[PDB]
Amino acid sequence: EPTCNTPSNRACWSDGFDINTDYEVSTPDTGVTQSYVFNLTEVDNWMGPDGVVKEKVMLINGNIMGPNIVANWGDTVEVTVINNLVTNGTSIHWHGIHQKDTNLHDGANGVTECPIPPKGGQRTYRWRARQYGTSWYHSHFSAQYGNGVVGTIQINGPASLPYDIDLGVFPITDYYYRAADDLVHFTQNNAPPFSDNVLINGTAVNPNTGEGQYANVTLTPGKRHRLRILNTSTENHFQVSLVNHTMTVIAADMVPVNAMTVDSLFLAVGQRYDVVIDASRAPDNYWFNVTFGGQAACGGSLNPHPAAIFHYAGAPGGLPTDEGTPPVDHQCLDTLDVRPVVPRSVPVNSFVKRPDNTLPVALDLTGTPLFVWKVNGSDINVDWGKPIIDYILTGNTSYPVSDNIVQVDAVDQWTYWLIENDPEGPFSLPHPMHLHGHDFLVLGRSPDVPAASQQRFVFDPAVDLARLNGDNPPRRDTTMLPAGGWLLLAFRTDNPGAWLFHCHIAWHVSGGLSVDFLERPADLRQRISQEDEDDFNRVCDEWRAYWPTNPYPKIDSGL
C-alpha cells in the first residue's frame, strides 16, 4: 500500500517506488494477499440488460461479469475457480499479467494446463502483481468468454499525471443474443455477424424496444477524473469519444505513458486505456459515443448509436441534447504515438527478414470448414488432455505440428518478429495480435491506408527500415496487424515458458490463428515448483477422466 500518493502527486507511491521505477524488474514486498472465489454456473433463459432473453450464458458468481479484482502494486492475487458448468471445462487467463516465472498459472488450456473439469472441478490460481494499471481476465476454453466468463483487474500504483477521482473500470463489450459455440460454428462457414448491441459497463438500451438503461457516469464539476476504458469484446473493435471533451491518455494496456491529449481513441479487442477527463465544461449531460471506423473491417453493431451518459453533479437529469460531430475514422488501427514513461531502446537497422523470424498469416479456404486461419502453414489445435507443459515435465520434445511451437532459446535477449497479413491472398482483414507473458515493442507497420482498400504491402528493406522506431516505441500487450500489410514486433526473452501469441478475435483464434512461443525450455523445467507440478497433474488426471463422458466434441482449436 502507498504512503505518498495524493491528488497533487500521483507520481509517488512509497519508499523506493514511483512512476520512474522499472516495474518489470523491481517489485514492492507488501506481504498482502487479495483472495477471491469464482463460481461458474450455466444459466439458461437469462434476462439480459436490454430486455432480450439470452438462450444460454455462463456466469461468474451469478453476475454478467466476475468480481472486479483490486489490489496494490506488489500484492499477490489468489483466485479459486470452481467449475459448476454442465459439460464445459474452463481455464482463467489473466490478460495483461506477465506471470514472471509463473507460466503454470497463465490459464492457457492445452498449453500451460488442462481444463478444470465441470460438475465441481476446482483449481487455485496464484500470481504476483508486478505491474500497476488496468487489465482483465477471461476464459480460454475456446470462445467460452463470449457467454460471460469475463471480468476486470485494477492493480493500483502511481500515475504520469495528477487526478482527483479514480472512476474505476469502464468495460465496453459487444453483445450477441446467440451463444458462443453457435457463433464459432457460424463463423466456420460464414462471415462474422454485427453485434446485437454494445454494452458499456454492463448496460445498454435496445434500439428497437427502448428497454434497458444507458451507463451513467457522474462527473464532479471542476475535477480531474481517471477513467479506465476496456474492450472486452470477442470481435468488435471500438472508437470512443465524449462530446465537448478531450481525453488525456496516461496508460496504454498495463504500461504507463506520458500525457497525450486526444479527441477520440481506438480500442482493439483486448486493448485498454487509462484516461483523465477534466470536468472543465458547462454543467449538462454529455454523450460518450461508441462508433466504428475502418468501414466495418473490424466490426459493427445493429445498435446504430451505442452510447453512455456523462452527467455533471448538480446539473439536471434526462438525456443529453447534443449529438455532436462524428469522430475521425481511425481505420482499424491503434495509435503509435504513445511513448512509455519507463523507456526501452532497441536497434532497428540490423533487422533482416529470415524464415525463422517471419510469421505469415493466411486464410486457407481449401478444406472443411471454409474459414481456417493458418500461421506459417498450420492452424493451431491444442490438446486439452496433453498440454505443452506435460511434454516439458516428461522430457518429450516430439511436439505435434498442430501446436505451432516456435522455440526461442535466446537468453534475456531482444527477439524480432515480422508478422505478414496474407498479402497474396484474395482478401485481408485486420487482426488484434496479443502476446501472453510479455509486453512487446511496436517497431513499425505497413503505411496507414483505408482498412477496406485491399492495398497490399510486403516488407521492403530499402524504404521500410527507415520507417521503424527503436527510440522508445509503444510498449503494450495488444496491437493491430494492418489489413493486407505487415507488423514488426520485439520482446525480450526474460520469462521462461510456453506463451501464446494470437489474434484476439474469438472466431479467428478458434479457426487456428495462433503460435506458441516456447521460450527457453530448459530453464522452464528447472523453474517449475513441486506444488505447481503436482497440481497440474492433479487437474490433468481429473480432466482426462472426465473427457470420455462429454456428450459433445471439440469443434475448434480449443483456444
Ligand X SMILES: *[C@@H]1O[C@H](CO)[C@@H](O[C@@H]2O[C@H](CO)[C@@H](O[C@@H]3O[C@H](CO)[C@@H](O)[C@H](O)[C@@H]3O)[C@H](O)[C@H]2NC(C)=O)[C@H](O)[C@H]1NC(C)=O
Ligand Y SMILES: *[C@@H]1O[C@H](CO)[C@@H](O[C@@H]2O[C@H](CO)[C@@H](O)[C@H](O)[C@H]2NC(C)=O)[C@H](O)[C@H]1NC(C)=O
Task: Select the residue interacting with ligand NAG from 9, 34, 80, 84 (CB under 6 A).
Answer: 84
Our finding on whether 400 is near ligand X (CB under 6 A) is no
How many residues form the binding site for Cl ion (CB under 5 A)?
A: 2
Residues 6+ apart with CB under 8 A from 289: 240, 241, 242, 243, 305, 306, 307, 324, 327
Our finding on whether 185 is near ligand X (CB under 6 A) is yes
Please state the closest distance from residue 142 (CB atom) to ligand X, in A.
Answer: 7
* Alpha carbon distance 123, 536 (integer Å): 9
Which does residue 201 bind out of Cu ion, ligand X, ligand NAG, none, counting CB within 5 to 8 angstroms by kind?
ligand NAG
Host H or E run for residue 216: strand 216-219
Which does residue 313 bind out of ligand Y, ligand NAG, ligand X, none, counting CB within 5 to 8 angstroms by kind?
ligand NAG
436 carries a ligand binding annotation: yes
Our finding on whether 245 is near ligand X (CB under 6 A) is no
Which does residue 550 bind out of ligand Y, ligand NAG, ligand X, none, counting CB within 5 to 8 angstroms by kind?
ligand X
Cβ–Cβ under 8 Å, residues 342 and 20: yes
Host H or E run for residue 93: strand 92-95
237 carries a ligand binding annotation: no
Residues 74-103 that bind Cl ion (CB under 5 A): 95
Nearer to ligand Y, 61 or 376 (CB): 376
Which does residue 27 bind out of ligand Y, Cu ion, ligand NAG, none, counting CB within 5 to 8 angstroms by kind?
none
Here the cell at position 39 is 463460481
Here the cell at position 355 is 524464415
By Cβ distance, which residue is nearest to ligand NAG? 317
Our finding on whether 217 is near ligand NAG (CB under 6 A) is yes
* Alpha carbon distance 229, 476 (integer Å): 15
3-state SS track over 267-334: ECCCCEEEEEEECCCCCCEEEEEEECCHHHCCCCECCCCCEEEEEECCCCCCCCCCCCCCCCCCCCCC
Residue (of 447, 442, 196, 218) closest to 337 by Cα position = 442
Task: Select the residue interacting with ligand Y from 15, 22, 356, 412 (CB under 6 A).
Answer: 356
- The torsion of the CA quartet 472, 502, 102, 160, rounded to 10 degrees, works out to 30
Which does residue 376 bind out of ligand Y, Cl ion, Cu ion, none, counting CB within 5 to 8 angstroms by kind?
ligand Y
Our finding on whether 216 is near ligand NAG (CB under 6 A) is yes
Nearer to ligand NAG, 218 or 537 (CB): 218
By Cβ distance, which residue is nearest to Cl ion? 436
Cβ–Cβ under 8 Å, residues 456 and 428: yes
**C-alpha atoms less than 13 angstroms from C-alpha of 222 in its C-beta half-sphere:** 1
For the chain, the residues before each gap (C–N > 2.5 Å) are none
Cβ–Cβ under 8 Å, residues 221 and 314: yes
Residue (of 184, 145, 185, 172) closest to 58 by Cα position = 145
Task: Select the residue interacting with ligand Y from 68, 80, 84, 376 (CB under 6 A).
Answer: 376
Nearer to ligand Y, 84 or 376 (CB): 376
Our finding on whether 505 is near Cu ion (CB under 5 A) is yes
Task: Select the residue interacting with ligand Y from 406, 442, 480, 528 (CB under 6 A).
Answer: 406
* Alpha carbon distance 122, 32 (integer Å): 23
98 carries a ligand binding annotation: no
Please state the closest distance from residue 103 (CB atom) to ligand Y, in A.
Answer: 20
Binding map of Cu ion across residues 262-301, x = CB under 5 A, - = no contact: --------x-------------------------------
Cβ–Cβ under 8 Å, residues 373 and 381: no
How many residues form the binding site for ligand Y (CB under 6 A)?
A: 6
Question: To which residue does cell 466490426 refer?
Answer: 299
Q: Which stretch binds ligand Y (CB under 6 A): 85-93, 111-119, 352-360, 537-545?
A: 352-360
Please state the closest distance from residue 406 (CB atom) to ligand Y, in A.
Answer: 5
Residues 460-519 that bind ligand NAG (CB under 6 A): none
Which does residue 33 bind out of ligand Y, ligand NAG, Cl ion, none, counting CB within 5 to 8 angstroms by kind?
none
Cβ–Cβ under 8 Å, residues 185 and 146: no
Task: Select the residue interacting with ligand NAG from 218, 258, 357, 378 (CB under 6 A).
Answer: 218
Residues 6+ apart with CB under 8 A from 433: 419, 478, 479, 480, 481, 487, 489, 501, 502, 503, 504
Our finding on whether 352 is near ligand Y (CB under 6 A) is no
* Alpha carbon distance 346, 340 (integer Å): 14
Our finding on whether 436 is near Cl ion (CB under 5 A) is yes
Nearer to ligand Y, 27 or 358 (CB): 358
Here the cell at position 322 is 447534443
* Alpha carbon distance 259, 338 (integer Å): 9
Cβ–Cβ under 8 Å, residues 176 and 199: no
How many residues form the binding site for ligand NAG (CB under 6 A)?
A: 23
Q: For the range 55-60, what are the long-range contacts, defined as Cβ-Cβ under 8 Å and sequence gap of 24 or more?
A: 55/177, 55/178, 55/179, 56/147, 56/179, 57/147, 57/148, 57/179, 58/85, 58/88, 58/139, 58/144, 58/147, 58/148, 58/149, 59/148, 59/149, 60/148, 60/149, 60/150, 60/151
503 carries a ligand binding annotation: yes
Nearer to ligand X, 132 or 292 (CB): 292
Task: Select the residue interacting with ligand NAG from 168, 327, 369, 385 (CB under 6 A).
Answer: 168
Residues placed in the known binding site: 93, 95, 138, 140, 431, 434, 436, 502-504, 508
**Residues of the shown chain interacting with Cl ion in the complex, contacts defined by CB under 5 A:** 95, 436
Residues placed in the known binding site for Cu cation: 93, 95, 138, 140, 431, 434, 436, 502-504, 508
**Residues of the shown chain interacting with ligand NAG in the complex, contacts defined by CB under 6 A:** 39, 41, 62, 82, 84, 167-168, 201-202, 216-218, 309, 311, 313-314, 316-319, 396, 398, 400
**Residues of the shown chain interacting with ligand Y in the complex, contacts defined by CB under 6 A:** 355-356, 358-359, 376, 406
**Residues of the shown chain interacting with Cu ion in the complex, contacts defined by CB under 5 A:** 95, 270, 431, 436, 500, 503, 505, 508
